[PDB]
Amino acid sequence: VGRLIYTAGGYFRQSLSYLEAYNPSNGSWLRLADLQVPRSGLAGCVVGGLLYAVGGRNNSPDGNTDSSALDCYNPMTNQWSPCASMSVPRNRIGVGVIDGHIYAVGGSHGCIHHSSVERYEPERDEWHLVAPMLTRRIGVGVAVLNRLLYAVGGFDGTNRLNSAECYYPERNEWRMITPMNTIRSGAGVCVLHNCIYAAGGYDGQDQLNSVERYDVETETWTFVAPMRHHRSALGITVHQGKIYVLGGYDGHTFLDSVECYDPDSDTWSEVTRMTSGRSGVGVAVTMEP
Ligand SMILES: O=C(COc1ccccc1)NC1CCCCC1
């Protein structure tokens, strides 16, 4: 009991500093302490009950600055604290957590498209580079299942990608997995039961409502019910066995829609609206303040 869906940052006209938390048990939203620096294209994650905001870019009136930052929000204090910065700025980053360690994957720095990957140790407040991916990927979706890290889709600067790869920590090695059926960058990628889901994104021509899932045993990708709304640069998380997608861009509107996927019925429903439409958020779940 008591867990909220936290959304940090995002983009609407400029990068945003908002931190807001949704309570699925009562439909309420809380506005919490703003990020110290506005950021879009970031990722969120949780370790030890603390919320982390990783990477991104500050698109502001005065400039566009890619972020190497890691910042930590403690729901007990409603305060953000800086942590050690990454080796490199990473906008349009993907993040996953393995056994209490944060992996920062890919992303962009100016015209540079990273294949590099680094790992944060919260107790030591240190980052260290690990093996790079086999592919340069920005707008990459990342998720962790069974202590293996998956990097899904993205953009290498020339083509959006249907490819995906898996990192095996004990060997510090990446291997390609079966590619998705659809090219996607800026998809929401998460884990639910024994599958990696890729929802939405941009294929180079259109924002997508399709959703497909990779079964890590059978190595297949299967489409599930599509979302009601096409969206790229959406936030995603999982809570109590359901997927939540937040915001994004549909080619017309920065969406405020939050949809929820029930795997038992293979259906999506609209569960709430964010307080304002935005794309490029970071999202994670932890205890309420
Ligand atoms: O939301 C963002 C930044 O975060 C992104 C995250 C993943 C992929 C792409 C971007 N930029 C918006 C600019 C205006 C057009 C819609 C995307």
Residue numbers in the entry: 324 to 612
From the paper:
A total of 768 fragments from the DSI‐poised library were screened against the Keap1 Kelch domain using X‐ray crystallography at the XChem platform of Diamond Light Source. Data processing resulted in 80 high‐resolution (1.0–2.1Å) crystal structures of bound fragments, which together covered the entire Keap1 Kelch pocket, including the five subpockets P1‒5. Thirteen of the fragment hits were anchored in the central P3 region extending to the hydrophobic P5 subpocket. Re‐synthesis of these five fragments and testing by surface plasmon resonance (SPR)‒which we have previously used to measure weak Keap1 binders with millimolar affinities ‒revealed clear, robust binding for fragment 1. This fragment consists of a central phenyl core and a cyclohexylacetamide substituent and binds the Keap1 Kelch domain with a K d of approximately 0.7 mM and hence a ligand efficiency (LE) of 0.25. Detailed analysis of the X‐ray crystallographic structure of fragment 1 with the Keap1 Kelch domain, solved at a resolution of 1.14Å, revealed three major interactions with the binding pocket: a cation‐π interaction between Arg415 and the benzene moiety of 1, a hydrogen bond interaction between the amide carbonyl with Ser602, and the cyclohexyl group of 1 occupying the hydrophobic subpocket P5. Based on these data and its synthetic tractability, fragment 1 was selected as a starting point for F2L elaboration. Fragment hit 1 was identified via crystallographic screening and found to occupy the P3/5 subpocket of the Keap1 Kelch domain, while forming specific interactions with key amino acid residues.
The interaction between Kelch‐like ECH‐associated protein 1 (Keap1) and nuclear factor erythroid 2‐related factor 2 (Nrf2) constitutes an attractive drug target for diseases involving oxidative stress and inflammation. Keap1 functions as a molecular sensor for reactive oxygen species (ROS) and a negative regulator of Nrf2. Under physiological conditions, Keap1 targets Nrf2 for ubiquitin‐dependent degradation and keeps Nrf2 at a low cellular concentration. A promising alternative is to inhibit the Keap1‐Nrf2 PPI using noncovalent compounds that bind the Kelch domain of Keap1 that otherwise interacts with peptide motifs of the Nrf2 Neh2 domain.
